[PDB]
Structures are given as structure tokens and as C-alpha cells.
Design a protein around this ligand. Structure first.
Ligand SMILES: O=C(O)c1ccc2nc(-c3c(Cl)cccc3Cl)oc2c1
Ligand SMILES: O=C(O)c1ccc2nc(-c3c(Cl)cccc3Cl)oc2c1
Lengths: 110, 115
């Protein structure tokens, strides 16, 4: 698994479960083309997004639907979503920690 | 100002100076239209982006050019940039501070919304 996403909830101290995550790759035309997507699991993780073969060098965007997550909890959040944009240059874990008016993200590249 | 941006550097323990920031607003046809831009000052702050009049309801994207910042400092960071996307002024005018704290492989952002 060359790409994994983990999402945590900083308010409740728990995995952020059932959060939609969409991954895009930049095409030769400056636009974002769909690449991979899923919903985080009970442990706040999303695996099986891609294969080593498909995950070539490029610029990728990981979009995390944080607004839906908070709304489902009865909480009006600030951000429309959380976006993480990076170049993959030949394992990537994109981690995100969420609060209604804040988020933090880190990359663990091993 | 109704929109302010503050950027700190978690590596040096300092304001992040001369960070380019571009703000876009979502148009009716769903394109990101340029709205404003600037660079952070020696205190890591960017003021004067817009006016109460021009900062109407909408979905805004504040893009902080973190890669250009780390690259101007001679190192190669992880992210291309840090984006902050939010609906603004949908229950009347508010004042927004978008704060960001930067490291080469990580960033954090928070919003302070008043009045
Ligand atoms: O339990 C896990 O599997 C887990 C793995 C990685 C991780 N990173 C992290 C984090 C972020 Cl993303 C931003 C700011 C501060 C912290 Cl501590 O929390 C967290 C939890
Ligand atoms: O000195 C200032 O003017 C200053 C103002 C606001 C602010 N927020 C912040 C922050 C972020 Cl943005 C993310 C995670 C943790 C923290 Cl403490 O640092 C910081 C510094």
C-alpha cells in the first residue's frame, strides 16, 4: 500500500469514521482527475486506495470531506473540506487531525 | 480588516515572513476566481486583502504558498501549498483570521471568527 489516509477527531478523541476521502492526480492540462476514493473505517483509516503500479510520480490532491463529518455530529464547522496537495516523488501516510475550526495534517513517508 | 492571514514557522520559532498568499472566491459557474493576494510581513501577518464592501457572501479559498516559502529558504518540503476553504459572511459580516503553522512535512491551520 503506497498510499494510506488516517483521520482523527480532536474533539472526541477518536478515529473519524465514515469520512469521505477523494484522491485526485494533476493531469497534463492543469486540471484534477479522479484517482481514488473511499470512506474511512472504524479505525479512521483508508487503505487500498491504489497500487504501486498506478501510483506514479505526480502531483496529488487528497480531499477529506470534513464538513459532512461535523454536520453529522450536529456541529457547524468552518472548512468546506480539508485538502492536502503534494508531489509523490519515488509508503505515504497522510494523517489529519480535525476540529470544527481547525485541522492539522502531516505526511509520514517510510 | 475583515480578512487577515497569520503564518508561523515551527522550525525556526518565528513568524513566516514573505509567504505568498492567494485568495480565490467561487463564482456562479463554479470556477475559482482570483479575489486577492499578498505576502506576509516581517510579523508573519497579511492585512489589507479586502474591504467589508468587497468581501461579500461566498466560498473562499486562501492558498498559502508553503512550497515557495520552504524553497526560497533552500529546502524541499512535502506539500505544494496549504489551502483553507470556507464559506464566509453567510449570516452577515464577520471578521476572519486564518492562522497557519508550518513545518516541512506538516501544517496546521485554525480560524478565528469574530462579531
Ligand atoms: O493513533 C494513530 O494511529 C495516529 C497516527 C498518526 C497521528 N498523527 C496525529 C497528529 C496529527 Cl495528524 C496532527 C497533529 C498532532 C497529531 Cl498527534 O495523530 C495521530 C494518531
Ligand atoms: O503569535 C501569534 O500571533 C499566533 C497567533 C495564532 C496562532 N495559532 C497557532 C497554532 C496553529 Cl495556527 C496551529 C496549531 C497550534 C497553534 Cl498554537 O499559533 C499561533 C500564533
Amino acid at each position: 500500500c503506497p498510499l494510506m489516509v488516517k483521520v482523527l477527531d480532536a474533539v472526541r478523541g477518536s478515529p473519524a469514521i465514515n469520512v469521505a476521502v477523494h484522491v485526485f492526480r494533476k493531469a497534463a492540462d492543469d486540471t484534477w482527475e479522479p484517482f481514488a476514493s473511499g470512506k474511512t473505517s472504524e479505525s479512521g483509516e483508508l487503505h487500498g486506495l491504489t497500487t504501486e503500479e498506478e501510483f506514479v510520480e505526480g502531483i496529488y490532491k487528497v480531499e477529506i470531506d470534513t464538513k459532512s463529518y461535523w454536520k453529522a455530529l450536529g456541529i457547524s464547522p468552518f472548512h468546506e473540506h480539508a485538502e492536502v496537495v503534494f508531489t509523490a516523488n519515488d509508503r505515504y501516510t497522510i494523517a489529519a487531525l480535525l476540529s470544527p475550526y481547525s485541522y492539522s495534517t502531516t505526511a509520514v513517508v517510510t
